[PDB]
Design a protein around this ligand. Structure first.
Ligand SMILES: O=c1ccc2ccc(F)c3c2n1C[C@H]3CN1CCC(NCc2cc3c(nn2)OCCO3)CC1
Ligand SMILES: Cc1sc(-c2ccccc2Cl)cc1C(=O)N[C@@H](CN)c1ccccc1
Ligand SMILES: Cc1sc(-c2ccccc2Cl)cc1C(=O)N[C@@H](CN)c1ccccc1
Ligand SMILES: [Mn+2]
Ligand SMILES: [Mn+2]
Ligand code: NA
Lengths: 671, 672
DNA sequence: AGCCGTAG
DNA sequence: GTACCTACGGCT
DNA sequence: AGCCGTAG
DNA sequence: GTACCTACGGC
């Protein structure tokens, strides 16, 4: 019913185009030749049939619609002669997700409709380079470039080696992660088409993009691109804590247009989590309005909420405009965006990260800011510090939701190797409720556990009689009292046994599996605690050194200008005479340069000077600024002359941040 | 969706009805969960006053409320079974919140009246300034509206049941005229609440806002608030035709934050229509990407499309920064927006308008711009011109979709009175297809007719055997050929007969019901063709008059500065020494003013002068500017001194616009 | 009828 | 006004 | 086995 | 990635 067929009933001259969604589909339908060309719009990512059970595959709506459209049936019953189109054309967006969707479609054609490929019926379209998605093209341009048999370039998909192609679909699309990961590491780098070559190149294109530009944080600032773009967007709009909140829909529309060419919900939902004090150990966004709850209620629609940077986020963006980090071109070349943030606090470890990539994933727990900075300071004084010594500063993860960690052994393994299992428990106590009866009271729950869902789980166990001795279950949580979950215990039953059982059978006890993978030098890397801290500290040294160099050039440039102004003030009569005698700006400029040994920049500055600069207060200000400047330049040079002084400055600034933003440990690590 | 409280004891339990999930989550968090339950609604609710019982009972929102209350409904209503003794209506403090409140009270009065009689129904009073309950933090919601310690609730009271019956009937019933009369009669520019009063005030607030601030165009620029805000948003962001396309998501978020506090889809779809050349006779938006089709395909998601002003839209905004129109504060006081656009072409008539309001609706067809401007010119030369004479310029509507209008008699009635029915017919011809067989070919369809859907209607008629003689039906439309819909006719059947039947039984012939209502001085008004031209010409006289006055004010301000600069350069050594000798800015200003007879503004301008202005070509170059200004000042004064000269200037600027943007008529008017 | 177009 | 489909990895 | 979070 | 509720007035 989503299919827009062509009028001809002769398959030999008929072509069906497969496109990503209705955005693309509408340009496609308007621009086509309705006589011979059909359009079937799909719905974004389609089922990977290499990983799915067969009944699921047969019951999936997108899959059925293709089968019905092609008309050949599937597997054993496939009948090539019954095909309704001799050309099946894959026309996804010319981007990395476009590529993924193509690997998913080919995988379906190969496993289920193979003769179709063998017959040479499957092609790949080749839309132009410039556009965002096909939804961004005018129908006429899409017709000429991509669908016009006269000018289009199609690739026909050719099946050459079928042993090789089976091995290929299994490797890329199959359920064994390791083989796929190996394939990516090995190949990762910075009109007839063999189906194996198309899968390998298209999948690597997608997989690479997800690893380096989506799902993994950078080790230096702890951010993924969508977060870095959000925060940079708030900086560039002047959405500072002192400044008022800006509506979220404007922030999101802004980020979308300038830096992040993806769907609005991905951006808004990333921003929302950054504002949740139950998600971020040190929240990066300050939100006004409904930003979700521990119960998994979603945030209010973006038209209603407002947001701005938290104060600690200013520390992430500090000195970004002092040539501290490298800018790069944005997605369409009309803007510039930061490659990384200055990150004056160790954000990766402080807020942690979780991302599902391709071939790999990352799980990094959050940490206490005071402990992390103290760890960085200990490292700065001792490059050969061991993990055990570092743990004297950093006890373990510190969750925003507090709770308990059981033992140091999982933490120790994770810090040493980057992988460990950490056991988390809710904070629970047994107390009397009167009448000789007792209750269990939970005041803190494990990190990332949905409270309401945890309670549902307990209720279901009680209902199914899978747990004994619970008379009542209520959520007494309130803004005023904090989290409070009350489990009433049957009189004379052992509450401690019931609690132990709750730990065994519900998320009241949950584990955090540490998998510390981050982008180091543009590549994913499993890193230990020390390595994550070493990368953070080198970054801070580079940022501070660069800021100091930038500030020196700027101060020197400004001093240069002020010397010219001071010269002008010393010979103001002569300066005025020279300018009056000149016919043009260009002559005056040359004459000032010749007569007073001034640079072009100095002369330009003098010619720009307003007459009010001539008053007593203004002359003094020019002289006062120059004298202030000379001292500043001397201070900057001192820092750059001595690596130790530079390093000390890094330590001092970290320390300042520690004292301003460092807070108490929340999570209790129990021996 | 219900988030219930702990207590089982209704006497102390309260249920809060909120607009959506946006307010629901803050409400869930902020409430006392022991005694406060939350039921989020799904925006506007069924009006039970206009609906039959089967539809009422099958509505999910009505069902959830019935289920939650526990009382049952109507005849089976049981007050004792109520699960809460306080049912609290908590919508946003805005016009649409007020509407939701009338809809809820309508359901309660009709299906659960004892609940009101018992005193169980209340209205919360959240604070204003928020633009949504989703906007408030949970602690603010609790303290201001849900905490029993600080909250102010209105208990709804039923005093006169006869009067309330009548009020619910008039405000919410199916008779539009009584409701329209109520709005016309009442419209104008400590813990208990009478239900009749609450209904009359809440409904009037909503109805008036929709009439004056949503669904009806201004007679002066032909726009509704959302369209005006979009265009002003484009001008402000500098999205002119010379600049590159801006992404739609960014344009929309900007309009949302700054001027239009409503949904993104309302803004984006309004912008998309301005871009469609099958909708707008002179498109106001230049769109890049998928902007929808005549088959009712919607535009691509806003993440993909880009947009900017068309060239003609520059004429809507021309002179906006010369104090030609009044600006007003935006919705939250942080911005300024235009009350109306200068509108240098008659956009109301040119592009037409359709809007469903409350108590009334509007339907104004588009027109040919060359014709309209000629009409305005003729009118400007003769205030007593008649409609018939005006029709010598303005033949009738001119649809972007072309086609035919049958006869001039509906056009005439609509122009004379503002109401008329106009028959639009497709352009269709009969031609041979070979073998002695024929086809009907359609290349133009009526305005606002979905082509795919019209084709479906035809296919339906053929399959149901309600029409004889059709053997095939195809849409051969393409970019190369334009609309082409082909109906094959059975050999030896009369094709003209088949075509006449298709006109009678399908949208291939359709009617446009003209009902020209626009806002005139802030009030809706049914207007005829001449009255719409008159208000337009007045607006233009006013814009040009104000523009001239602004320019004159500006030019004198400038001449004044230059007289100070002339004096400064003539005495420059003494000027500089005066400044050098002054300790501060203030002292220099006083000294310059006393010594050289300079105003405060002249002296500031002298102190702001850069040294590079002392170069040679300046004494004369300043004198060059000063000389042109005097001439210009004289030119502006002449215009303000003679109405006829001002009127001629309006005529001239309209004529230039007609020659630059005026195009050929598309819709053919056949007599008859 | 169910559409048209700004709203929740 | 709102609700689900899909990919992807690892842990239970 | 369903969840975590950026994506279509 | 997409689909389907509601108000409102007139034909
Ligand atoms: O609830 C439901 C339930 C079902 C359903 C089905 C199909 C279907 F399409 C949808 C459904 N829905 C909701 C709806 C899906 N939504 C996703 C979000 C999208 N938002 C656009 C947007 C706004 C912006 C912006 N960019 N883009 O830039 C900044 C300003 O605001 C609008 C469509
Ligand atoms: C999947 C990819 S892509 C990539 C790469 C290479 C070069 C340029 C750009 C990129 Cl993106 C490297 C790997 C990879 O697996 N690296 C190994 C290191 N042993 C590994 C194994 C396990 C965990 C993390 C890392
Ligand atoms: C419904 C409203 S509100 C309003 C009004 C009054 C005063 C201030 C602000 C406002 Cl908005 C006037 C009417 C109305 O019906 N006007 C009559 C013309 N007398 C009408 C009748 C039929 C068609 C159009 C217009
Ligand atoms: Mn894409
Ligand atoms: Mn509202
Ligand atoms: Na008809």
């Amino acid at each position: 019913g989503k299919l827009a067929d062509c009028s001809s009933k002769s398959p030999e001259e008929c072509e069906i185009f497969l496109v990503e969604g209705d955005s693309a589909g509408g340009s496609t339908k308007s621009g086509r030749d309705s006589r011979t060309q059909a359009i079937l719009p799909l719905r974004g990512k389609i089922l990977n049939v290499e990983k799915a059970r067969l009944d699921r595959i047969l019951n999936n709506n997108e899959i059925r619609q293709m089968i019905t459209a092609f008309g050949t049936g599937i597997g054993g019953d496939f009948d090539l002669a019954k095909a309704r189109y001799h050309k099946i054309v894959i026309m996804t967006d010319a981007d990395v997700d476009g590529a993924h969707i193509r690997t998913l479609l080919l995988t379906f054609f190969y496993r289920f409709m193979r003769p179709l490929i063998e017959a040479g019926y499957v092609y790949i379209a080749q839309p132009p380079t410039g556009y965002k998605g096909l939804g961004e093209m005018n129908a006429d341009q899409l017709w000429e470039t991509t669908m016009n048999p006269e000018h289009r370039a199609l690739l026909q998909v050719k099946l050459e080696d079928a042993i090789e192609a089976d091995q290929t679909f299994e490797m890329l699309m199959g359920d064994v992660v390791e083989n796929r990961r190996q394939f990516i590491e090995d190949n990762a780098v910075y009109n007839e088409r063999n189906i194996t070559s198309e899968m390998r190149e298209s999948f690597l294109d997608y997989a690479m993009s997800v690893i380096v530009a989506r799902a993994l944080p950078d080790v230096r600032d702890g951010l993924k691109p969508v977060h870095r773009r959000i925060l940079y967007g708030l900086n560039e709009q002047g959405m500072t804590p002192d400044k008022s909140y800006k509506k979220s829909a404007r922030i999101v529309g802004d980020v979308m247009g300038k830096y992040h060419p993806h769907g609005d919900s991905s951006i808004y939902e990333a921003m929302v989590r950054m504002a949740q004090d139950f998600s971020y150990r040190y929240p990066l966004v300050d939100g006004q309005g409904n930003f979700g709850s521990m119960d998994g209620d979603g945030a209010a629609a973006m038209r209603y909420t407002e947001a701005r940077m938290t104060k600690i986020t200013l520390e992430l963006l500090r000195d970004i405009n002092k040539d501290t980090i490298d800018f790069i071109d944005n997605y369409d070349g009309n803007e510039r965006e930061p490659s990384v943030l200055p990150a004056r606090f160790p954000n990766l470890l402080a807020n942690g990260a979780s991302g599902i990539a391709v071939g790999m994933a990352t799980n990094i727990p959050p940490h206490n800011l005071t402990e992390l900075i103290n760890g960085v300071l200990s490292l700065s004084k001792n490059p050969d510090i061991s993990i055990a010594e570092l743990m004297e500063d950093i006890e373990g993860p510190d969750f925003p939701t507090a709770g308990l960690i059981l033992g140091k052994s999982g933490i120790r393994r994770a810090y040493e190797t980057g992988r460990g299992s950490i056991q988390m428990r809710s904070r629970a106590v047994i107390e009397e409720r009167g009448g000789g009866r007792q209750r269990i009271v939970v005041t803190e729950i494990p990190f990332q556990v949905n409270k309401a869902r945890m309670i549902e789980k307990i209720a279901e166990l009680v209902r199914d009689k899978k747990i004994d001795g619970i008379t009542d279950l209520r959520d007494e949580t309130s803004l005023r009292t904090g989290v409070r979950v009350v489990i009433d215990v049957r009189k004379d039953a052992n509450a401690s046994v019931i609690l132990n059982n709750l730990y065994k059978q519900t998320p009241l006890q949950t584990s955090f599996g540490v998998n510390m993978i981050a982008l180091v030098n543009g590549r994913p890397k499993l890193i230990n605690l020390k390595e994550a801290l070493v990368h953070y500290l080198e970054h801070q040294k580079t940022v501070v050194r660069r800021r100091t160099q930038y500030n020196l050039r700027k101060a020197k440039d400004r001093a240069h200008i002020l010397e010219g102004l001071r010269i002008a003030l010393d010979h103001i009569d002569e300066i005025i005479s020279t300018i009056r005698e000149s016919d043009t700006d260009k002559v005056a400029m040359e004459s000032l340069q010749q007569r007073f040994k001034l640079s072009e920049k100095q002369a330009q500055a003098i010619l720009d000077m307003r007459l009010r600069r001539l008053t007593g207060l203004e002359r003094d200000k020019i002289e006062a600024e120059y004298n202030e400047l000379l001292n500043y330049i001397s201070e900057l040079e001192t820092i750059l002359a001595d690596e130790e002084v530079l390093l000390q400055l890094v330590r001092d600034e970290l320390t300042e941040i520690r004292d301003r933003f460092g807070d108490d440990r929340r999570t209790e690590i129990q021996l």
